[PDB]
Ligand binder design. Structure first.
Ligand SMILES: CC(=O)N[C@H]1[C@H](O[C@H]2[C@@H](O)[C@@H](CO)O[C@H](O[C@@H]3[C@H](O)[C@@H](O)[C@H](O)O[C@@H]3CO)[C@@H]2O)O[C@H](CO)[C@H](O)[C@@H]1O[C@@H]1O[C@H](CO)[C@H](O)[C@H](O)[C@H]1O[C@@H]1O[C@@H](C)[C@@H](O)[C@@H](O)[C@@H]1O
Ligand SMILES: CC(=O)N[C@H]1[C@H](O[C@H]2[C@@H](O)[C@@H](CO)O[C@H](O[C@@H]3[C@H](O)[C@@H](O)[C@H](O)O[C@@H]3CO)[C@@H]2O)O[C@H](CO)[C@H](O)[C@@H]1O[C@@H]1O[C@H](CO)[C@H](O)[C@H](O)[C@H]1O[C@@H]1O[C@@H](C)[C@@H](O)[C@@H](O)[C@@H]1O
Ligand SMILES: CC(=O)N[C@H]1[C@H](O[C@@H]2[C@@H](O)[C@@H](O)O[C@H](CO)[C@@H]2O)O[C@H](CO)[C@H](O)[C@@H]1O[C@@H]1O[C@H](CO)[C@H](O)[C@H](O)[C@H]1O[C@@H]1O[C@@H](C)[C@@H](O)[C@@H](O)[C@@H]1O
Ligand code: QT5
Ligand code: QT5
Ligand code: QT5
Ligand code: NA
Lengths: 131, 133, 131
C-alpha cells in the first residue's frame, strides 16, 4: 500500500510566464515499482507569497512526464498589496499510472510577472490505489 | 481491492444561492463502485474560486452525501468591496461511514452575503476507501 | 486499511507566541495498533480567522509525541484588515510511525500576537500505508 512523499523548505525566487518545476517536489513513480493503478496526488504549498505590482499571485500545477494534470492559483485582491500575505494553496488530482507515468512533480508560474516565494515547508504526496 | 474515487470539473454556471446547491459534476457514485461499508476520506478541492458582491464576499462549500451535509467551510475577502476579487484556494477534508446508507458523495456551495459563485478552472472531489482502526 | 479521523467545531480563542495544541485535533495512533509503516496526515482548517492589529495570521503545525513534523501559516495582506476574512488552511505531511509515534495532533500559534479563531468544522485525518 505505497505512500510517496517529497518535501522542500525553500526554492530560489524566480519570475516565469510559463510552468517551471518547483525544485525538489518530485516523486519517482518508476523507482517505486508503480506501473499501473491510480495515484491520488496532493500538492501542498501552505505558506507561499507572490511579489509584484499588478494583482500578484502564483499558479501551481501537478505534472507528470506527460505534462500538466491539473492546476490552480491564488491571487491577492489589491493591485499592490500593503503586505504580500501568506496564501495557503492545496491542489488534488488523481492520475492513471498505466498511461506511461514515470514521475509526478510540482510546477509553478507567475501571475502577471509576480516573483514566486517558498521559504518554508511545502510537500508533494501520493497514495496508490486502483479503479 | 484499494479503490480511489475521483471527479473533476473545469467550470460551473455562475449562481447566487442563500442555501446549498450542488456544484454540478462534483459527484462520486459510491453505490456504482460496490463500496457498501467501511470509511471514505473525502477531499473537496476548489483551488481557484472567486466570489463577486458588495458586502465582504465569499463562498461556503460543503461535502454532502445522500444523507445531507457532512462538513462545510468558507473563504471570505477582508474588504467590503475588494479592489479585485482574487483567487482564494479552498480545500475541505471529511471522513464518512459508508454503511449508514451512503450511496453518493457530492460538493455543494452557497453564497456568503449574496455573492455570485465562480468556478472557471479545475476543481475536484476525491475519496480514498479504508476501514476503521 | 485504516483511516483515522478527528474533527472539532470550535476552540477557546487564545493568543500564543509558541505552538499549543488545537483541542480535539488528535489521533491516537498507538490505540489503533499502528506500530510501523507511514501515515499521510492532513490538517484541514477550512474557515479560521485571526484578530489583531499587525498583519494578523495563524501558524498551524502537524505534531506527534516527538514534536512538530511540518508547519505553515496564513496572513492577511493589510496591517489592520477592514474585516478578518476566512482564510482556508490545509497542511499535508507524511510521518514514520516506527520512530516512536503514539499520537498525531494539530497545533497552532499566533502571527504577531493574533488571537486565533476556529468557530466551525476543522479536521485531522490520516491514511496508513508503507514505504
Ligand atoms: C508584514 C510583512 O509583510 N513583513 C515583511 C515586510 O513587508 C513590508 C513591505 O511590503 C512594505 C512595502 O513594500 O510595507 C510594509 O512595511 C511598512 C514600511 O514600508 C516598513 O518599511 C516598516 O518597517 O513597516 C511598515 C509597516 O509595519 C511591510 O512591513 O517586508 C520585509 C522585506 O523587507 C519582510 O519581507 C517582512 O517579512 C517578515 O519578515 C520578518 C523578519 O523581520 C519575519 O520573518 C516575518 O515572518 C515576515 O513576515 C512574513 O512574510 C511576509 C512576506 C508576509 O507574508 C507576512 O504576512 C508574513 O508573516
Ligand atoms: C486582476 C483582475 O481581477 N482581472 C480581471 C479584471 O478585473 C479588472 C477590474 O478589477 C478593474 C476595475 O477597473 O481593475 C483592473 O483593470 C483595470 C482597468 O479597469 C482595465 O480596463 C485595464 O486594462 O487594467 C486596469 C488595471 O490593470 C482589473 O484588471 O476584470 C477582467 C475583465 O472582466 C477579467 O475578469 C480579469 O480576470 C482576468 O482575466 C484575464 C484575461 O482578461 C485572465 O484570464 C486572468 O486570469 C483573470 O484574472 C483572474 O481572475 C480575476 C477575477 C481575479 O481573480 C485575478 O486575480 C485572477 O488572476
Ligand atoms: C464582515 C465581518 O467581519 N463581520 C463581522 C464584524 O466585522 C466588522 C467589520 O465589518 C467592520 O465593521 O469593522 C468592525 C470593527 O473591527 C468589525 O471588524 O465583526 C463582528 C463582531 O465584532 C462579527 O464578528 C461579524 O461576523 C459575522 O457575524 C455574523 C452575525 O452577526 C455572521 O455570523 C457572519 O458569518 C460573520 O462573518 C464571518 O466572520 C467574520 C469574522 C468574517 O470572517 C466574515 O468574512 C465572515 O463571513
Ligand atoms: C485565470 C483563469 N481565468 C479563467 C480560468 N482561469 C484559469 C485558472 C487556472 C488554470 C487555468 C487552466 N490552465 C485557467
Ligand atoms: C461564519 C461563521 N461564524 C461562526 C460560525 N461560522 C460558520 C462558518 C462556516 C460554517 C458554519 C456551519 N454551517 C459556521
Ligand atoms: C514566516 C516565515 N518567513 C520565512 C520563513 N517563514 C516560515 C513560515 C512558516 C513556517 C516556518 C518554519 N517554522 C517558517
Ligand atoms: Na504532454
Amino acid at each position: 500500500m505505497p505512500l510517496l512523499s517529497a518535501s522542500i523548505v525553500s526554492a530560489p525566487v524566480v519570475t516565469s510566464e510559463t510552468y517551471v518545476d518547483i525544485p525538489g517536489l518530485y516523486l519517482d513513480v518508476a523507482k517505486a515499482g508503480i506501473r499501473d493503478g491510480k495515484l491520488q496526488v496532493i500538492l501542498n504549498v501552505p505558506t507561499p507569497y507572490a511579489t509584484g505590482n499588478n494583482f500578484p499571485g502564483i499558479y501551481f500545477a501537478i505534472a507528470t512526464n506527460q505534462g500538466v494534470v491539473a492546476d490552480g492559483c491564488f491571487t491577492y485582491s489589491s493591485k499592490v498589496p500593503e503586505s504580500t500575505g501568506r496564501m495557503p494553496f492545496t491542489l488534488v488530482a488523481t492520475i492513471d499510472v498505466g498511461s506511461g507515468v514515470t514521475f509526478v512533480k510540482g510546477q509553478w508560474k507567475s501571475v502577471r510577472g509576480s516573483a514566486m516565494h517558498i521559504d518554508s515547508y511545502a510537500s508533494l504526496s501520493a497514495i496508490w490505489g486502483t479503479a
